[PDB]
Amino acid sequence: LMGGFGLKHPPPQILIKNTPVPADPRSTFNGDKLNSFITQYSTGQVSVEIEWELQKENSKRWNPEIQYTSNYYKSTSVDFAVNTEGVYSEPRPIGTRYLTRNL
């Protein structure tokens, strides 16, 4: 109901964790669990690639369609770009429905 593709078997969820590294323990045995660790974090790269299938539009409409376009007039900044501070923003929401079809 938020929109999308419903899936019985959606793309699986991917879990990631840092392995705990203990700090130096006591030199005499204690049976309690170890609560003292070295502080860590990790960084890296992630890639994702999706193949999409397209359904081409085949239409006998004579007159031109409605299209999504960018504003022609001058502006202080470009839409869908960074500003002076280096912040990327998205000006408006963009839907999918422009071309037409007979009911």
């Binding site: 004579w62 031109p64 299209q67």
Partner: protein, 104 residues
């Protein structure tokens, strides 16, 4: 092919294949007799109100000719939209011409 059979069919279509598009158009025409079947000398000169810039000499014939040399002949407004929004360039390659179903 006698008087009772048609010598062609109506083709108006566009086909978008990959790196090319093919347009085809059909129209109905009417051809009058011009000049009463005569060739005629025509001219214009400065003897009348014509200035020297507009003078000419030539001939009008008793013949017609076909002109498809405008783009709206070959493209619907929607086809022209597909072209100009999606492509960096285009050029013509080859053409075919047919003249059929004549009646005097």
């Amino acid at each position: 092919d006698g008087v009772g059979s048609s010598s062609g069919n109506w083709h108006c279509d566009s086909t978008w294949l990959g790196d090319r598009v093919i347009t085809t158009s059909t129209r109905t025409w009417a051809l009058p007799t011009y000049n009463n079947h005569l060739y005629k000398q025509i001219s214009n000169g400065t003897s009348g109100g014509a200035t020297n810039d507009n003078t000419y000499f030539g001939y009008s014939t008793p013949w017609g000719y076909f002109d498809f040399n405008r783009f709206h002949c070959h493209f619907s407004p929607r086809d022209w939209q597909r072209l100009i929004n999606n492509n960096w360039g285009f050029r013509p390659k080859r053409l075919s011409f047919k003249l059929f179903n004549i009646q005097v």
